[PDB]
């Protein structure tokens, strides 16, 4: 009575509409639910035929999207097309696996299928390009040219989500793009800090350092992943502090006596904040305080 | 906050939200693109399904003594079909 | 998990209602010597004593630890450490002398919850949650 | 321990929760207010007695033993009763 | 004065002697319980341990202990435990039955739903009805469609009652 | 102004009245309190003179009492005189040291003085006579001739109280008279039990054993010390059980099968009570119970 | 249950029992063979002694802040004598 | 926190305890009943006001600040006042 | 995350610096405190321990610890302890003063009551008035009869106040 | 002794009155970042936090165990084992986020009362009870 071939003809258009990010309706969605359950139950080979049809449609749409994406030879155009297409694809991959709950139970495999297909289609070939473009955009942003944050956020979340390695969810992401981010940020502060310190002054350097620390914190909160914070944000601002304040701790302790004999409130707040970061930085200013005591 | 479960004929079996989410397929059905349509599930099955939903949500922690669920064999096969779809 | 099972599961809901307990024993015998035996058995660790919880067959029971191969207290103190139903609990039901009656209640055992084995507790929870029906592959 | 009651309003089959000692006043305000049905221009029609008119605790405090989860009683509402599907 | 606390359920002698009879019959005569163990009292120097029916639930093991001289239970008692490598926990009768049914007794297999829905035969059944302490609506429906041993199966909810 | 010699003349009669168990008055008692405090304070050597006068009067009265006690050469007359005199003396020793609280604080020494003086006066010479006479009285009492319990109780409490050795309060008492009591009781049951068992019967032996156990328990509660119960009562009824029921455990286990096949309620209660006493008496009756089971 | 502390002249300074037992000599004086006579202790010192008894029995556990006991030097030596006798 | 008061009945100097919000009725029954003095044939004479006649909570609820352990207020009674001894 | 809890009393920097001055003066210049000890902050690697005044109360020892960077006490803190052979207990200021007075500063002797009662002189006195937190009526009377250092004695109740 | 000191001594009477506590800190700074610092300091063991008990200078304080040479809890859990005034106590004062306010109370530590050293406790009690005045012999 009920077989895969008797209803797959009606099944396919709704699957394609869900896949290709098109407008859909609730009633058709519930009819699709009932149809997939009935085909999974009655037909002896119904689940297998459903799975192979799903994989065929997934592969076809992934090939179409990949062909569209590779059309843009320009790096920035390719980046914007890739982020738009990935956002729509990821919304679909969040929506798509819900109908095939009966298929999943009998044998989510659908979400893994989508993620792996998109990965092996596009990510495996343009991961390096996306990475370098992301660092270029983020370093331009840190220079003072604000850009579209959603692009870098989507790049990062594609890195965290499309990790084929099942040992850790964010293994490839954390051990490639996160460490590249730390190295890039460290080199930017290494290039920038001595010039500002030598030119603008001392208290100017401290206030600029505080402002840049706040900006780096907010950019770590927004750009860098915060769903799990797996040694990412902590490593980022730890490298920031060990590249700025641990770097110029000699200047800080040199001016510590001047602060002690001059009673700067902002500098006091700064060193109170920075005792915790330095593993053994407490002793300079506390010994200066006791020299005041003695 | 209730969920409206429209049966095949058109009967509405509106049930408290927290009861309906005991079945996985309902949870997956509400998500994505209230109103839920059950054309294969008629009154003499959906009524007992929602009634079992209430019975299960209340008699699930009471380890003292849980009374059984007497249901007639005249609807038992259709009830198994509904429990295979929803649950 | 265990910290939440107290407030949802019904076994401890019906147990931790400040239940009444009564020492069962030689009720056939005269009360005077019944109370005397209760005293000279509670004072020393060379006997056994039970408490029937006034109505059911669910009765606690104390045995000397020499019979086997956070500590227990037996003045009017009846501390009891035990992992009831897989979740650690503590029972502080005192008894009243000259009447052979008392009260009882259960409290969470935080120390063992933070110190007992975690892999064994997870194994027990997994074994308790699952169901045998529709499991074996056919 | 409370008693679960349900409404049979013509085509509607509201399934909800009731307390053991609920009053008609609080029953009408919210419990049957899912379909936006305030007591104005409406009267409950519980069986033939119709639960009198309301504000009565003599019968609204129904026992939990007569309406067990498996077969809880009905109430009904209007301003008829749809027969359930037959096997 | 040292002391260990063990929750026990007073049980009339009848139930305990019939439970011992059933366990010993099933373990040796029947084949359903050919996996359990048995420890009498002469191998248990504890002054009150009368018998122990050991159930090897795979990695862990359930142990049911019966007592001799409880104060007017001559009055016996029973205490159910889930011992696993020096980690022992008390267990109520319903959960003990549920854990017992998880391994030994039979149940409608995963392929026992589509077969009955489409009218085909069902190969395995559920002789341990008592091992299903509420279940999924599929279980209730299937048991109504397929309504379920001459020497009764050993359950720990029949025992602790009364 | 205030000196010992100026008021000791008035002090002495009230001290003697308190000592010699004579009628006294509250007003004189409070005046004695005030006088002893004033003499202790003002006179430089007042406390020492008070102490030496007290010791002189104590020694004189103790010598008088000892001379009175040794007058009765008859053992029973000496017993009754000694118990009466000791009861009055111990009441005084409980009452006497309260007035000299100031004397005690400046340097109870008074209670120890009385106890040691009476000990070295009379106890050191008639302890053996009192012990043997107490055993004679107690074994006559156990034979069936009720006597004055207060005599033996006073003998025991004099043993517990007049112990000169300060390592333990009741050391001499517990390891002389208590052990003599255990030996005497054990020999009495050894002499008595086999005859009654052979003559009267079996169930008669059990009921008589229960009655005698109850009688021995009540006599341990009354006669034997219960203020501390330092290994005394426990040792006593432990020796009673190991001389009666542990002694005839072979007969008990022989009749255990008869009880099992006859269902005697009183025998059931008796064996149930006697399981705890016997270290390993559980196995016979429980193996018989399983033989019923098997 | 009170204790009657008759002073030298004849004043009665009856005080609650639990207060008076804070002094050892009173405890030893009541024992053996109410009524207590204080011929060497007159009003202007015995009054302060019983008053200190109340003050001490109440302000003995309050570790927060215990106010001092201001007593004039005109009676201080006799008060030391009374505190040497009683306390 | 309560306030401690004493009675100065001619030759008598009852020292006792009073609560912060005590009423005259409960003050007379027991607190001054040590000498077996029921309210019949007696009236308290607190200072000149004499605490009115009784059953008054306006003044009987005296503050604990006015009377302290070192220096508590007096009440007095009759149906005079003995002077304390002078140094 | 491991964590240890220690009760502290916020104290203004005045009180703590004057207490340090008094302790260092009495220990070295005076002779009343020639028995105590002192641990500065460079020999205490703890990030907040600023100083420790060690009081060898015979077998046991009292230890008073001062803190550097409390959150707006720059804000210092103090915590008083009674450490004895790996058994350390917290102690309130009044009890700390009482235990301090038990050994170090001289106090009226046992022969200081009859001497003043009879009019003779009193040889020892009580310079640690603050060490007496209520006392026996003999103490109150004697202190009134004998009403009591130019460099003030170090007390731990003057410090924790405010 | 310790089991009785709770109900008579006034320090714990004034402490175990379900007292209010408030986290002191960077109040000069804004409330939002103050909450952020409280959260990121309470979550991890690399900071310090105090609670002033709303009015006095008697404030608890937590320093990480790495700074030094029954365990503590820091969700909304603030278990604190400490021998206050010679008698073991336990403090279970939770805190409320988004308001920087909370509650507090003390409870007896039975486990340490039955497991801590007895000779040291007796020595401390003897040293606490006695008085220095009229002690040295002259
Ligand atoms: Zn089954
Ligand atoms: Zn002093």
Residue numbers in the entry:
A (entry chain 2), F (entry chain 7): 12 to 118, 133 to 319
B (entry chain 4), G (entry chain 9): 17 to 49, 58 to 111
C (entry chain 0), J (entry chain 5): 7 to 75, 84 to 88, 94 to 157
D (entry chain 3), H (entry chain 8): 1 to 79, 89 to 96
E (entry chain 1), I (entry chain 6): 3 to 75, 81 to 140, 143 to 157, 160 to 173
What did the study's authors say about this model?
Human APOBEC3 (A3) cytidine deaminases are antiviral factors that are particularly potent against retroviruses. As a countermeasure, HIV-1 uses a viral infectivity factor (Vif) to target specific human A3s for proteasomal degradation. In this process, Vif adopts a “double-hijack” mechanism by recruiting cellular T-cell transcription cofactor CBF-β and Cullin-5 (CUL5) E3 ubiquitin ligase complex comprising CUL5, Elogin B (ELOB) and C (ELOC), and RING-box protein 2 (RBX2) to induce polyubiquitin chain formation on A3 proteins for subsequent proteasomal degradation. Vif nucleates the entire complex by directly binding four human proteins, A3H, CBF-β, CUL5, and ELOC.
The same cryo-EM data contained a class of A3H-unbound dimeric form of VCBCC complex, which was reconstructed to 3.5 Å resolution. All three Cullin-repeats (CR1-3) are visible in this form, likely because the Cullin-arm is stabilized by the additional contact with Vif from the other molecule within the dimer. The architecture of the VCBCC complex core resembles that of the previously reported crystal structure. Vif α/β-domain forms a globular core with CBF-β by forming an antiparallel β-sheet between Vif β1 and CBF-β β2-3. A small Vif α-domain with a zinc-coordinating site mediates the recruitment of ELOB/C and CUL5 through a three-way interaction between Vif-ELOC-CUL5, which is typical for CUL5 recruiting SOCS-box containing substrate receptors.
